[PDB]
Ligand binder design. Structure first.
Ligand SMILES: [Mg+2]
Ligand SMILES: [Mg+2]
Ligand SMILES: [Mg+2]
Ligand SMILES: [Mg+2]
Ligand SMILES: [Mg+2]
Ligand SMILES: [Mg+2]
Ligand SMILES: [Mg+2]
Ligand SMILES: [Mg+2]
Ligand SMILES: [Mg+2]
Ligand SMILES: [Mg+2]
Ligand SMILES: [Mg+2]
Ligand SMILES: [Mg+2]
Ligand SMILES: [Mg+2]
Ligand SMILES: [Mg+2]
Ligand SMILES: [Mg+2]
Ligand SMILES: [Mg+2]
Ligand SMILES: [Mg+2]
Ligand SMILES: [Mg+2]
Ligand SMILES: [Mg+2]
Ligand SMILES: [Mg+2]
Ligand SMILES: [Mg+2]
Ligand SMILES: [Mg+2]
Ligand SMILES: [Mg+2]
Ligand SMILES: [Mg+2]
Ligand SMILES: [Mg+2]
Ligand SMILES: [Mg+2]
Ligand SMILES: [Mg+2]
Ligand SMILES: [Mg+2]
Ligand SMILES: [Mg+2]
Ligand SMILES: [Mg+2]
Ligand SMILES: [Mg+2]
Ligand SMILES: [Mg+2]
Ligand SMILES: [Mg+2]
Ligand SMILES: [Mg+2]
Ligand SMILES: [Mg+2]
Ligand SMILES: [Mg+2]
Ligand SMILES: [Mg+2]
Ligand SMILES: [Mg+2]
Ligand SMILES: [Mg+2]
Ligand SMILES: [Mg+2]
Ligand SMILES: [Mg+2]
Ligand SMILES: [Mg+2]
Ligand SMILES: [Mg+2]
Ligand SMILES: [Mg+2]
Ligand SMILES: [Mg+2]
Ligand SMILES: [Mg+2]
Ligand SMILES: [Mg+2]
Ligand SMILES: [Mg+2]
Ligand SMILES: [Mg+2]
Ligand SMILES: [Mg+2]
Ligand SMILES: [Mg+2]
Ligand SMILES: [Mg+2]
Ligand SMILES: [Mg+2]
Ligand SMILES: [Mg+2]
Ligand SMILES: [Mg+2]
Ligand SMILES: [Mg+2]
Ligand SMILES: [Mg+2]
Ligand SMILES: [Mg+2]
Ligand SMILES: [Mg+2]
Ligand SMILES: [Mg+2]
Ligand SMILES: [Mg+2]
Ligand SMILES: [Mg+2]
Ligand SMILES: [Mg+2]
Ligand SMILES: [Mg+2]
Ligand SMILES: [Mg+2]
Ligand SMILES: [Mg+2]
Ligand SMILES: [Mg+2]
Ligand SMILES: [Mg+2]
Ligand SMILES: [Mg+2]
Ligand SMILES: [Mg+2]
Ligand SMILES: [Mg+2]
Ligand SMILES: [Mg+2]
Ligand SMILES: [Mg+2]
Ligand SMILES: [Mg+2]
Ligand SMILES: [Mg+2]
Ligand SMILES: [Mg+2]
Ligand SMILES: [Mg+2]
Ligand SMILES: [Mg+2]
Lengths: 109, 177, 135, 132, 72
RNA sequence: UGCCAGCCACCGCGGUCAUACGAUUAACCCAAAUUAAUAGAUCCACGGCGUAAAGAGUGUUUAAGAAAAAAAAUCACAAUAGAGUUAAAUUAUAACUAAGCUGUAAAAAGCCCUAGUUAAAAUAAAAUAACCCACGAAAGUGACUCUAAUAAUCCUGACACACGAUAGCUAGGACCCAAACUGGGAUUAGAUACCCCACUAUGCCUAGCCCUAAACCCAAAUAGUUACAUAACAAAACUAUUCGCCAGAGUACUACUCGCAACUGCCUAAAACUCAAAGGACUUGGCGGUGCUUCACAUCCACCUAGAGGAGCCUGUUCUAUAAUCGAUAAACCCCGAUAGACCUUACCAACCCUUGCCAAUUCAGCCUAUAUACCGCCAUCUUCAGCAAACCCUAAAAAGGAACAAUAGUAAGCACAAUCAUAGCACAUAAAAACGUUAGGUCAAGGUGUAGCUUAUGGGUUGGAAAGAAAUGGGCUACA
């Protein structure tokens, strides 16, 4: 605006980033509650294998399992990361495949 | 028009008056130009839309061995020449307006177009007309028949003299050889 | 080809410069003639802008003191009984005579309008012109 | 919209034979008949045979003379002999042309059990009636 | 056009008024409920001062009027 | 594999032929590292505020600032606040007179203590003048008169101060007429609405609150300039001094706070979450129970004739029934492919049978099997509609547009229409023709094909068998004399 205004208001500061689902950490350890299924948003349709998990942050969170096929039993321990899934509403947490109770999605050779 | 403000002399009771000194200075240069083109054996195209004078301007031009276009002006005429006129064609070397307007009081296309084509243009601006695209203007009255006639016969004569002088210098060229 | 841009600059500019870039391989006629005798102003394109605000024109209206007299003449008699001709370059009207008489009675050193006007009227009466005398 | 034996308007660049440019309703008005024989007149017999026969000679000439055929093939039947005229494009070296002349005449004559006469009129390029 | 912004507002307002009608008395509670907190916090605010300024009692002639609950 | 399994950082990919999935095959690029994740560095606005997010409802002053010269002239008269007054109309209420009066597209209800006329206070509201453009800071102000009266030797300025349309609230008056609500009456599937009829809060005054508007001329104040200059549209573009305001869209004139004579209020005004948009202006279409003109010539209306819907029968669909075809199925199906099924046709069902099984040769034949949303063929349809389209040319930019004949940027061969042909001479009439596209319109059962499937069978033969009517309906025929 004017100079006195730009003086009184200071220069603009770049606002600190809002921490996401992982609350700033790269990954999270988690424990399974109930394996289940969700339906995608409109233009595309499927059914995605989801879990409900608890995080070492003591928060419960809905997360996504990548790949075709898996074994996920209650009380299994998992690792999770912050990939958001573009199909579904509100699932912000992927499960890392290959660690703990989820082994690398199997090969059919 | 707003671009006549310099060429004007002043308002006499609401009617505007051109500066005749400037008229002569300009017209001299215009006629000189016209001539030097004629001598160099090139096309000259008179143009007017103005009805009163149509006949004059053709009757003038036909007698100069110069061409007139006094008529409706088809659109792509100079711009798209080879399609309109013929498979390949020569274009006017100089275009000369005895009025700068069309009967709807806009600038004649030929102005925009000549100017578009790198053709020089010699024309009579009037107090309402826009001079700025015309190569050599002559500020002056386009409307009164004494004026049209005058300008006609003058461009006529400049042409004729250029042509004669051409012939002569050609004969001298032929004796020198 | 060439350059068809009507706004960019004068035809002289474009042509000279396109030859300068050796695109146009043939010097055109009017070009050389032009170089020889250029016109007053380059034929450059200008938007015809409207005038806003306080801007007026530069034209000077046209008036003579002769006119300040003629005003009074037409104020009395009207347009001359001899009518007018715009074909005849030397035509003098009733008005013009009046102006001349008034100029000579001004060189006779009379500052009063009544005297100047009326006596000039007497000069034209002596010249046999009919002064209608309208109120 | 009648699609019968017609050639559609292109972007305007498509070359067209005089025949293929004249639509079915035009037969006997501008266009002529590609074949001639007695069989369809009022009191006449065996029209069918000359039709099968004709068809087979269309296919036969298209197949014996590859890529060199110009316009559709003109059959005439006169007093038991066939007169087969063809517009043929010049592709082949002339030897091959006469090889196939003899070949055709003989073969057909012995097939239809009637004497065949063959005529090739050679043309530099397909005649263009329209567009191009 | 810009009506399409106004439509939203129009709706959101209408849908709000309707709400505040059904919910009226629930609302009325929670308003007064907080006014009784206000007046109390206010009180404590001043109480804090006696106790901070060393006085035992509230100073002479202090009834500490109720501003927030003012009615009629 | 077939909107499934799955993938994507953004746009997105998977619905039978996926370079987006999973796996191969080639490549690409990094490389003792490579990807993924999460944090940073970097990243707004010395840009804006008519239509896009943003000039506060209004003025004055404080704080704080900015400063050459000129900068108080008058209402063309409707600021405000008082006090007084009334011309038109309307209403009480009488006098006559007639039975109706009111009310709509049409009615009904309603009222006849109604209606017309003649009289006539209060209350309320102020034709024409106004085609004027004044006065106020804004809200606002236009019947009449008188009183009081319109800040500042004139720059900007708030959360401070004083005002602020309607509606609303409190108390008291007023009440002609209007009128939310409500009750009747119609309309309607419904009609809590639009139309009708009553009647109320309320508009009115006096005093006190409330403080909101599309409070918008969506355009801040004060000095300037018309130079430079067209995003678009609208009211043409900009300096200089200031203050106020704007950092995606919702969420949200919202939740919590603070303050207020408000206590379904006003003001100030977030986040979680969700999305990859949300917005402004424009461009061609299409559409319009918008407006205007001009038509319809078997054609909408008005008109004329002869029929369909009823009856019997013929024949086609649709349903039920059958072991027992397929296709068409708004206009553009329904005596339709059929100018045609007793066997045949024949594709169907039932049983039996035959496996280089038509041909010159072929790990080859043969398939009325799935794709008409892969197609060519032939057509329907707008359509007796006038447009389609290359090659160019123009437009202070072009998505696109491109005419005016006392002509203003259009030229253009082509295909359409038109013209000619046919109906044995004319003419008209009919026939024919009728592009580009549209309907993923029709048809893999005329034939042919792309992709898929079948191969001792989805192939090829022999023998029989089908096409019954509870009905429902389309078109015909014959009648009713
Ligand atoms: Mg991911
Ligand atoms: Mg047809
Ligand atoms: Mg909403
Ligand atoms: Mg609360
Ligand atoms: Mg499924
Ligand atoms: Mg595949
Ligand atoms: Mg990719
Ligand atoms: Mg892949
Ligand atoms: Mg490393
Ligand atoms: Mg930057
Ligand atoms: Mg702007
Ligand atoms: Mg806005
Ligand atoms: Mg915002
Ligand atoms: Mg404002
Ligand atoms: Mg303010
Ligand atoms: Mg507001
Ligand atoms: Mg000070
Ligand atoms: Mg200053
Ligand atoms: Mg009062
Ligand atoms: Mg009265
Ligand atoms: Mg009365
Ligand atoms: Mg009355
Ligand atoms: Mg009515
Ligand atoms: Mg009644
Ligand atoms: Mg009025
Ligand atoms: Mg006004
Ligand atoms: Mg003042
Ligand atoms: Mg001030
Ligand atoms: Mg108010
Ligand atoms: Mg009120
Ligand atoms: Mg009342
Ligand atoms: Mg009363
Ligand atoms: Mg009433
Ligand atoms: Mg009701
Ligand atoms: Mg209805
Ligand atoms: Mg209505
Ligand atoms: Mg009442
Ligand atoms: Mg009022
Ligand atoms: Mg207003
Ligand atoms: Mg407005
Ligand atoms: Mg505003
Ligand atoms: Mg301000
Ligand atoms: Mg001021
Ligand atoms: Mg300036
Ligand atoms: Mg534009
Ligand atoms: Mg936001
Ligand atoms: Mg509000
Ligand atoms: Mg609120
Ligand atoms: Mg506050
Ligand atoms: Mg009819
Ligand atoms: Mg019709
Ligand atoms: Mg009947
Ligand atoms: Mg019947
Ligand atoms: Mg059937
Ligand atoms: Mg059945
Ligand atoms: Mg079917
Ligand atoms: Mg079908
Ligand atoms: Mg159909
Ligand atoms: Mg029929
Ligand atoms: Mg049978
Ligand atoms: Mg079969
Ligand atoms: Mg199907
Ligand atoms: Mg189709
Ligand atoms: Mg097809
Ligand atoms: Mg046409
Ligand atoms: Mg075009
Ligand atoms: Mg004829
Ligand atoms: Mg005809
Ligand atoms: Mg026809
Ligand atoms: Mg025709
Ligand atoms: Mg279909
Ligand atoms: Mg259909
Ligand atoms: Mg087939
Ligand atoms: Mg095939
Ligand atoms: Mg069999
Ligand atoms: Mg059988
Ligand atoms: Mg029936
Ligand atoms: Mg009958």
């Amino acid at each position: 605006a004017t100079l006195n205004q730009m003086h009184r208001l200071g220069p603009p500061k770049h606002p600190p980033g809002k921490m996401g689902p992982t609350a700033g950490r790269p990954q999270l350890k988690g424990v399974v509650l109930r394996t289940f299924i969700r339906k995608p948003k409109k233009p595309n349709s499927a059914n995605r294998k989801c879990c409900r998990v608890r995080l070492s942050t003591g928060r419960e969170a809905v997360c996504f399992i990548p790949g075709e096929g898996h074994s996920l039993q209650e009380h299994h321990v998992v690792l999770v990361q912050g990939g958001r899934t573009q199909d579904l509403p509100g699932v912000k947490l992927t499960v890392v495949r290959g660690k703990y109770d989820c082994g690398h999605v199997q090969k059919k050779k | 028009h707003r671009f006549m403000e310099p060429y004007l002399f002043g308002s006499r009771l609401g009617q505007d008056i051109i500066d005749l000194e400037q008229t002569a200075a300009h017209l001299q240069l215009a006629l000189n130009f016209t001539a030097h083109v004629a001598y160099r054996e090139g096309i000259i195209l008179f143009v007017s839309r103005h009805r009163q004078f149509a006949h004059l301007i053709e009757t003038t031009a036909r007698d100069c061995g110069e061409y007139a276009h006094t008529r409706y002006f088809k659109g792509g005429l100079l711009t798209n020449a080879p399609l309109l006129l013929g498979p390949g064609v020569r274009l006017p070397d100089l275009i000369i307006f005895l009025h700068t307007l069309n009967n709807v009081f806009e600038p004649h296309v030929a102005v925009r177009d000549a100017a578009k084509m790198n053709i020089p243009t010699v024309g009579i601006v009037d107090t309402n007309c826009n001079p700025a695209l015309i190569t050599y203007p002559v500020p002056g009255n386009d409307d009164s028949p004494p004026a049209v006639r005058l300008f006609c016969r003058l461009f006529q004569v400049a042409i004729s003299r250029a042509k004669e002088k051409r012939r002569q210098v050609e004969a001298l060229y032929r004796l020198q050889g | 080809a060439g350059s068809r841009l009507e706004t960019v600059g004068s035809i002289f500019s474009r042509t000279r410069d396109l030859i300068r870039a050796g695109v146009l391989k043939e010097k055109p006629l009017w070009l050389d003639i032009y170089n020889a005798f250029p016109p007053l102003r380059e034929p450059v394109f200008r938007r015809p802008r409207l005038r806003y605000g306080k801007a007026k024109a530069a034209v000077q209206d046209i008036f003579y003191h002769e006119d300040r007299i003629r005003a009074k003449f037409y104020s009395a008699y009207g347009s001359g009984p001899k009518a007018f001709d715009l074909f005849n370059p030397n035509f003098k009207s009733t008005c013009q005579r009046f102006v001349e008489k008034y100029i000579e009675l001004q060189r006779l050193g009379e500052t009063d309008e009544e005297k100047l006007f009326v006596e000039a009227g007497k000069a034209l009466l002596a010249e046999g012109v009919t002064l209608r005398r309208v109120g | 919209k009648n699609r019968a034996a017609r050639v559609r308007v292109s972007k305007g660049d498509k070359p067209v034979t005089y025949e293929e440019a004249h639509a079915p309703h035009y037969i006997a008005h501008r266009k002529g008949w590609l074949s001639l024989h007695t069989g369809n007149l009022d009191g006449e017999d065996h029209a069918a045979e000359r039709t099968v026969e004709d068809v087979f000679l269309r296919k036969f000439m298209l197949g014996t003379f590859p890529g060199c055929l110009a316009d559709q093939l003109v059959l005439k039947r006169r007093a038991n002999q066939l007169e087969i005229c063809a517009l043929v494009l010049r592709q082949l070296p002339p030897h091959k042309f006469y090889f196939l002349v003899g070949y055709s005449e003989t073969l057909l004559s012995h097939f239809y059990k009637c004497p065949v006469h063959l005529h090739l009129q050679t043309v530099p390029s397909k005649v263009v009636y329209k567009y191009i | 056009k810009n009506i399409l912004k106004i439509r939203r507002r129009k709706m959101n307002h209408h849908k709000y008024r309707k709400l505040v009608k059904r919910t009226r008395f629930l609302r009325r509670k929670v308003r007064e409920g907080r006014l009784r907190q206000k007046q109390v916090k206010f009180e404590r605010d001043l109480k804090r001062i006696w106790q901070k300024a060393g006085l035992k009692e509230a100073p002479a002639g202090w009834q500490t009027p109720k501003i927030y609950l003012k009615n009629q």
